[PDB]
Ligand binder design. Structure first.
Ligand code: HEM
Ligand code: CL
Length: 401
């Protein structure tokens, strides 16, 4: 599965890293990707895996490339080359209109509005789990929490959750029932009638807002609205599900860090930021719009380049002892939510989900562990993650509140 080396790529830059199967995976995903930052590895390498593509390995180049959309286009953001969500695949200027609209639905003011709804949802999930003394965290909290948040955001009935969870799962873990493109249309078929109706009788919900939106001085098309609404759903799922899982896996394994946040709950927002750095999980890419010499390396029009958001915060040049989790770091440097014009619109909503999760969980279930005998398995990709997270606790050490 190595693609033949293109003639413009010098051999000395070749490191065959497989973003879907890194060799050090059993050590943890972030550790597995950090091999790219060992001192014998150049700032910019070519891998022959996954069709062949560049990888920027250090924070400086990752940031620079994300800033320079004129050379590094979002028209093809996934490796391999072989997905019509908006605004993911748009560059400025087209991107800014759609981004402005989506910001109306998940922006800081909306997050401030839903804050206690978000807390009530977390409390309800946690309280239902608390007496069991155990859960499949990824299944029982990490997924229900953001999907329930979406149903609130989008004004959608609870009965639709199982079917919506299934459709979104088909894009990450397919059953074999249908192609990826079929899962997409199924989702769109769910969304179109809701969009069309709320054009006519708008609510205060995200679908209403997007549906009644304007681009190019005219009403948004149903095609545009469906592709945007689709991103608002999937965008806040896989990342959140997997990030909360990494964070809870770490806390389950580190009673000292649990204790710190229990004793000092005011450090939880700072803890959130440090977890976002240490357990960063996205690795998107760009495509070269033209021939371009970049830090002494000749890139060719059409080359793909993976720019792992994950790696900037792990780079020792950005944070000392980057593998060490320290909630009091004076400066937490990362690009966990990206960088440049596509920087996560959900960043404020995600931080609140994380903070609320940490606070409510540590309040009700302060002492918890990985299930005895369980070895946590991870997966690597565009959004890296946790396959499952079995947790246990003693319900006599918990409290309802
Ligand atoms: C831990 C949680 C999250 C992480 C790590 C994360 C990460 C990212 C990253 C790296 C990007 C930019 C991708 C690129 O430049 O190619 C992005 C974009 C985006 N995210 Fe998130 N995200 C998270 C949560 C959310 C949530 C909760 C939502 C709510 C729906 C959301 C909605 C979006 C949207 C709409 C974009 C597209 C922005 C654009 O293309 O202009 N994200 N996210
Ligand atoms: Cl699980």
């Amino acid at each position: 599965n190595l693609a033949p080396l293109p003639p413009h790529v010098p051999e000395h830059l070749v490191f065959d890293f497989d973003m879907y199967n890194p060799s050090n995976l059993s050590a943890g995903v972030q550790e597995a990707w950090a091999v790219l930052q060992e001192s014998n590895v150049p700032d910019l390498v070519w891998t022959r895996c996954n069709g062949g593509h560049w990888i920027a390995t250090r924070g400086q180049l990752i940031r620079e490339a994300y800033e320079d959309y004129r050379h590094f286009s979002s028209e093809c953001p996934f490796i391999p080359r072989e997905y019509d969500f908006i605004p993911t695949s748009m560059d400025p200027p087209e991107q800014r209109q759609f981004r402005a609209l989506a910001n109306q639905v998940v922006g800081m003011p909306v997050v401030d509005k839903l804050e206690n709804r978000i807390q009530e949802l977390a409390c309800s999930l946690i309280e239902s789990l608390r007496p069991q003394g155990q859960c499949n965290f990824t299944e029982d909290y990490a997924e229900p929490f953001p999907i329930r948040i979406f149903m609130l955001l989008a004004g959608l009935p609870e009965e639709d959750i199982p079917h919506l969870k299934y459709l979104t799962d088909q894009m990450t873990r397919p059953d074999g029932s249908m192609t990826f493109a079929e899962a997409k249309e199924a989702l769109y078929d769910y969304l179109i009638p809701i969009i069309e109706q709320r054009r006519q009788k708008p609510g205060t919900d995200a679908i209403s807002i997007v549906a009644n939106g304007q681009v190019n001085g005219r009403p948004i098309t149903s095609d545009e609205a469906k592709r945007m609404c689709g991103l608002l759903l999937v965008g806040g799922l896989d990342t959140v599900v997997n990030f909360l899982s990494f964070s809870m896996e770490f806390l389950a394994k580190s009673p000292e860090h649990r204790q710190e946040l229990i004793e000092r709950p005011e450090r939880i927002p700072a803890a959130c930021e440090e977890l976002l750095r240490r357990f960063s999980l996205v690795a998107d890419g760009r495509i070269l719009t033209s021939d371009y010499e970049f830090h002494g390396v000749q890139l060719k029009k059409g080359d793909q380049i993976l720019l792992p958001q994950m790696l900037s915060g792990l780079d020792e040049r950005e944070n000392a002892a980057p593998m060490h989790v320290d909630f009091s770091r004076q400066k937490v440097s990362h690009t966990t939510f990206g960088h440049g014009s596509h920087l996560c619109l959900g960043q404020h909503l995600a931080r609140r989900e994380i903070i609320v999760t940490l606070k409510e969980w540590l309040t009700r279930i302060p002492d918890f562990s990985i299930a005895p005998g369980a070895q946590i398995q991870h997966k690597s990709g565009i959004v890296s993650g946790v396959q499952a997270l079995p947790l246990v606790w003693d319900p006599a050490t918990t409290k309802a509140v």
